[PDB]
Design a protein around this nucleic acid. Structure first.
Ligand code: ANP
Ligand code: ANP
Ligand code: MG
Ligand code: MG
Lengths: 344, 390, 163, 73, 98
DNA sequence: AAAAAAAAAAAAAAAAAAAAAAAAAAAAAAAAAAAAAAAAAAA
DNA sequence: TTTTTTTTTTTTTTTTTTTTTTTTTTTTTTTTTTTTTTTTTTT
């Protein structure tokens, strides 16, 4: 509780320190405190009868019990921030501290769900194994929680990947899959809020599209839903843009990359399922719950989305210049756009 | 300002004309069972307007004295307070019932309901919101309220409920326009394909139709975005104020430092459309769902939520009616200490209680006693308590 | 045979209820009326402090009065045909000390038939008890054991502090 | 019953002056807060059982008490 | 009939609750500080003898186990021993256990 | 001659209620392993 | 009367399939209110 110790830890854990042994040492201090306190509490409770007759009935102490909680509330936030470190030992120790905290319920769980989700995409297997197991335990007790922090999850995930360098976050979808409302909402949120009119970084769009194509599906309702809304937005937005370009430019480069990425996602989906355009246009949202219950057949080795999307990102890659070659690439992009709108 | 005094006549077991004494900053209303004090709270709940079902009597005619026994007393009733704020003026609200109907009066001038309401809203009493009247069993209920009702309350208090019909009407308009644009686009595409397979008039028809539909869609889009932005901004302001203050308030009220309370929404892009939930941690225990917690923590949690909601937008007074239903002497002492430490310069608070540890800290008492008759006729008499030690 | 049994037991329960409730409240009276009939419901008519003019219905009463009515009904149905054991949790919270004395004396008389477990936070209700208990909550677990009348009567009222 | 003990206190407090008027301010003249509240509440619970009739004129003023029907004399 | 005593392990906040000196016949009042956990006693007594409690969702069953410290339990058990000396309960013994 | 008080009919509202579709815990069935018990033999 | 292998019966466990049941809006109905409409009284 002392002020100097407080400021000491809250400076070492933050402030972009050169040392990486101080941070490891701090996290190890917290970890050993938590473990030792837990063991002491348990093994001191086990032998009650020797001291029972000499303890009050009207007191019900808390300062010996609540203390272990209070401590965390002074440091917790900083520890969570330490997930975004380039070293690996720091990340491992931070995850150990959080997984010792939560397993005694000391702190409120749904404020450290997003970080615990973005920790689901590390290379080392033991890391994300521990993380995902912690997540399924957080869910199995409390039904709602994960649905509250789902998009912030992916945002933190993308920040983690840009700090380090199937689907990376497929597990999250497996957890949120069951409920029709939840799933539907989540999909619409991510899609409508990231591609249509948000000036998001051209890399986050790539990442979202990669994850939208990779996701494990176990019915037929989901890709048809995605395709349907994709259709509507593509139609309106693309039509407006292309017709204004015909009436008539880096802004075009940006919005064109957006719509093109969305196009290629649609095409990869349609090729991975091989569904007839008639069936797609026939389907409407909430037509019936049980009609599209068939398991989607998958053609082997049709994954061309990664290569294709990287090719079309290499076409742009935030490259605007006062040179003839980019103008040529842009006119080809426009003719390609006409071809895309002509796809049948 | 505050609530100076009220006046009853024939209303719900208060025969004759009598003046309830002037109210100090923090009073208490003691008395033995069946004396009829909690309906005095109903009296306060009747001036400010309240649906009859919450007044624990059907049909609104059984308010007049002596109806539940079988013989009424008159065909009138007359309840009226005198709100007094700084500036040496005094306003007198009333609400008289005749036959079945009810008429409202301000300063002995007949008015219509809407202006009466708006006058109260000017004062600061969101009558339909009901964030400051607690009935006997309501306090426990507030903590366990289903998320939907809590969203309803938070939308009511914050003036973001009036903008509903406009919003979803705009929503339906834009969804229809978008569907029709897609329809026309695909029809034009298939007509183009059937043309290339080889008609002209149909092509131009669907083209012009698609153009008109697009224009209407764009007309719907920005307007929907405008109204949704409005509702979101208002709701979000109110909600963030409540959240920060509930955390601080709960820590202060439990006189500990290991308690948390998280007031969190679902669907955090449009919080007004989905239920909000409330999870609190005990003073010295683990995180458990709200249902599991014992009654003693439940009542402190509900008190925390009430005080936070009030601490966003002020309300001149409370009416607490037996909040100490289940609290032990220590917890009641803590709650009473907080009420005393807050009551001076923040809000007037009038409580009904039985445990002497709650009306001992009080500063002015109002005894309420019965008298035998054709029906139990109640009467009132006051007592000062700021001329005594400890 | 079923209809006949219904009739006789309703009669006995009606009489016992009128007796108990006349005893609990110092002054008043109440009875159980059947509905139209086959039968469809049982209504209750209660009156006190006027004793002849008053004839009430249920929704407009007090905490103490409602709790007294309910307790009267339960004690009646006990006095007709005893049940294995009764467990009361925080029964006395709404009512006042005078009624609490009445309820405790009725418990004291009725004890000799069935087993009674109950909790409370006010002294009067343990005016009549065989053996008390306590519940201590240390190290995030709760234990239960026997205690003596002195420490219990002290904990219930005698101390008023932060511990 | 503490209440009837205080009732005996009332009987003896009245039989000394005989002006059939037990004032409350005097009976609480030299006490602390808790016992003052207790005494006031005791007057109320006594008035319930008709054993005493009490009078109050002004909104904030002393209480004047006098024996009623069931004083038991 | 006459509840002799109760045994609880891992139910709601009772880790390991061995035997207690037996109840009486007349009146056994329980007191305890606010939030101590007296109501869980009656929830045990009702969880065994009354069917209504066991109509909950699987989540509630998962949440009806002492999750305090150390490992997490999986097998809770509540036992009640009472004596039908008056042979009110038909199966003839002196202390029926359930 | 015209303001006022008082009952009655029409209209908005709200709570009991009739209805339908997605979901979910539960009951029934079937196969395999295991565990207690009867039968000829026997000590 | 009591022990043993072999056979016979019970029962127990674990999946898959059917079944009641809870919920989830949506719609309908009915009582309450209240505003207007209708009807004598009086200054
Ligand atoms: N309209 C009425 N006219 C006359 N008496 C009534 C009326 N409504 C209720 N009562 C009775 O008058 C008393 C008022 O009840 P109530 O106001 O609830 O008392 P109380 O203040 O709650 N008692 P308590 O909470 O125990 O201190 C009760 O006896 C009612 O039965
Ligand atoms: N499954 C559980 N595991 C661990 N602790 C639990 C569990 N369920 C409840 N608790 C806690 O155990 C305590 C139970 O309190 P409870 O048994 O309701 O006491 P109480 O005596 O009724 N309080 P009061 O209202 O004064 O009577 C609370 O602190 C709960 O949060
Ligand atoms: Mg009350
Ligand atoms: Mg309790």
């Amino acid at each position: 509780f002392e002020q100097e110790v407080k400021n000491l830890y809250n400076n070492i854990l933050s402030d972009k320190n050169s040392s990486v042994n101080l941070k490891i040492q701090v996290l190890k201090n917290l970890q050993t405190y938590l473990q030792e306190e837990d063991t002491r509490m348990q093994q001191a409770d086990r032998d009650w009868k020797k001291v029972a007759k000499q303890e009050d009935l009207k007191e019900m102490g808390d300062v010996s019990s609540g203390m272990s909680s209070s401590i965390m509330q002074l440091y917790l936030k900083q520890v969570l921030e330490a997930f975004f470190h380039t070293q690996s030992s720091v990340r491992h120790f931070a995850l150990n501290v959080i997984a010792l905290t939560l397993n005694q319920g000391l702190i409120h769980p749904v404020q450290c769900v997003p970080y615990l989700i973005a920790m689901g995409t590390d290379p080392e297997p033991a890391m994300r194994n521990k993380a995902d197991q912690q997540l399924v335990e957080i869910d199995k007790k409390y039904a709602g929680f994960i649905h509250m922090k789902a998009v912030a999850g992916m945002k933190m995930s993308y920040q983690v990947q840009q700090a380090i360098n199937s689907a990376l976050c497929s597990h999250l979808y497996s957890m949120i899959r069951g409920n029709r409302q939840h799933r539907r909402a989540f999909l619409i949120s991510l899609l409508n809020l990231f591609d249509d009119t948000a000036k998001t970084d051209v890399t986050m769009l790539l990442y979202i599209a990669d994850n939208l194509a990779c996701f494990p599906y176990q019915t037929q309702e989901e890709p048809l839903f995605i395709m349907h809304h994709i259709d509507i937005t593509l139609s309106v937005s693309g039509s407006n843009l292309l017709q204004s370009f015909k009436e008539s430019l880096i802004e075009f480069a940006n919005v064109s990359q957006g719509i093109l990425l969305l196009l290629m996602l649609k095409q990869h989906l349609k090729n991975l399922c091989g569904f007839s355009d008639s069936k797609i246009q026939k389907y409407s949202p909430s037509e019936s719950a049980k009609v599209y219950d068939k398991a989607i057949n998958r053609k082997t080795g049709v994954h061309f989305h990664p290569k294709q999307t990287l090719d079309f990102l290499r076409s742009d890659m935030a490259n605007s210049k006062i040179t003839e070659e980019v103008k040529r690439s842009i006119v080809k992009q426009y003719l390609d756009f006409k071809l895309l709108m002509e796809h049948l | 300002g505050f609530l100076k005094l009220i006046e009853i006549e024939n209303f719900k077991s208060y025969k004759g004309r009598q003046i309830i004494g002037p109210f100090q900053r923090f009073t208490a209303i003691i008395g033995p069972n069946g004396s009829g004090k909690s309906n005095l709270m109903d009296a306060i709940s009747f001036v400010l307007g309240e649906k009859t079902s919450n007044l624990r009597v059907k049909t609104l005619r059984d308010l007049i004295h002596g109806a539940p026994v079988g013989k009424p007393a008159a065909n009138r009733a007359f309840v009226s307070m005198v709100y007094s704020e700084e500036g040496a003026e005094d306003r007198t609200f009333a609400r008289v019932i005749v036959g079945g109907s009810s008429e409202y009066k301000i300063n002995n001038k007949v008015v219509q309901l809407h202006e009466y309401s708006e006058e109260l809203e000017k004062l600061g009493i969101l009558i339909k919101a009901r964030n400051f009247l607690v009935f006997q069993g309501a306090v426990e209920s507030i903590a366990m309220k289903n998320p939907k009702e809590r969203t309803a309350l938070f939308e009511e208090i914050s003036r973001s409920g009036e903008l509903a019909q406009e919003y979803d009407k705009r929503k339906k308009e834009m969804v229809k326009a978008e569907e029709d644009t897609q329809f026309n686009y695909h029809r034009k595409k298939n007509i183009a394909a059937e043309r290339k397979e080889a008609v002209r008039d149909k092509f131009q028809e669907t083209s012009d139709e698609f153009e008109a539909a697009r224009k209407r869609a764009k007309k719907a889009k920005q307007a929907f975005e405008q109204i949704k932005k409005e509702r979101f901004d208002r709701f979000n302001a109110c909600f963030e104020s409540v959240a920060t203050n509930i955390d601080e308030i709960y820590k202060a009220l439990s006189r500990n430092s290991s308690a948390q309370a998280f007031l969190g929404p679902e669907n955090p892009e449009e919080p007004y459309l989905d239920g909000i939930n409330y999870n609190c941690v005990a003073p010295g225990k683990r995180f458990r769902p709200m249902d599991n917690l014992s009654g003693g923590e439940k009542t402190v949690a509900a008190l925390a939520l009430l005080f936070a909601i009030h601490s966003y937008k002020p309300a001149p007074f409370f009416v607490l009616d037996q909040i100490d239903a289940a609290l032990d002497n220590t917890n009641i002492g803590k709650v009473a200490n907080y009420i005393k430490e807050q009551s001076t310069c923040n809000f007037q608070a009038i409580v009904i209680s039985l445990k002497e540890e709650f009306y001992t800290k009080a500063e002015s008492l109002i005894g309420v006693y019965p008298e035998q008759g054709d029906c139990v006729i109640s009467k009132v008499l006051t007592f000062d308590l700021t001329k005594y030690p400890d | 045979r079923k209809y006949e049994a219904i009739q006789l037991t309703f009669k006995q329960v009606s009489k016992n209820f009128s007796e108990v409730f006349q005893k609990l409240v110092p002054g008043g009276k109440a009875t159980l009326v059947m509905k139209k009939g086959q039968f469809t419901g049982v209504g209750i008519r209660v009156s006190f402090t006027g004793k002849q003019g008053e004839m009430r219905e249920m929704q407009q009463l007090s905490g103490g009065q409602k709790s007294l009515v309910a307790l009267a009904l339960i004690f009646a149905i006990q006095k007709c045909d005893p049940a294995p054991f009764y467990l009361f949790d925080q029964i006395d919270q709404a009512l006042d000390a005078q009624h609490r004395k009445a309820v405790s004396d009725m418990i004291m008389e009725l004890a000799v038939h069935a087993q009674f477990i109950t909790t409370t936070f006010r002294p009067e209700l343990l005016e009549s008890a065989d053996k008390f208990y306590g519940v201590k909550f240390r190290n995030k677990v709760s234990h239960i054991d026997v205690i003596t009348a002195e420490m219990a009567k002290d904990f219930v009222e005698d101390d008023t502090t932060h511990g | 019953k503490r209440t009837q003990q205080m009732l005996h206190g009332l009987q003896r407090a009245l039989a000394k002056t005989g002006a059939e008027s037990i004032s409350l301010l005097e009976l609480c003249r030299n006490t602390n807060r808790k016992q003052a509240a207790a005494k006031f509440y005791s007057f109320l619970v006594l008035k319930k059982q008709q054993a005493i009739e009490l009078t109050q004129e002004e909104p904030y003023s002393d209480i004047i008490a006098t024996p009623g029907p069931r004083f038991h004399i | 009939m006459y509840i002799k005593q109760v045994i609880i392990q891992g139910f709601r906040s009772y880790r390991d609750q061995t035997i207690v000196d037996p109840f009486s016949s007349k009146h056994n009042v329980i007191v305890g500080r606010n939030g101590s956990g007296k109501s869980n006693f009656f929830y045990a007594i009702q969880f065994v003898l009354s069917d209504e409690f066991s109509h909950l969702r699987p989540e509630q069953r998962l949440a009806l186990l002492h999750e305090g410290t150390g490992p997490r339990v999986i097998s809770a058990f509540v036992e009640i021993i009472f004596d039908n000396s008056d042979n009110r309960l038909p199966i003839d013994k002196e202390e029926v256990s359930l």
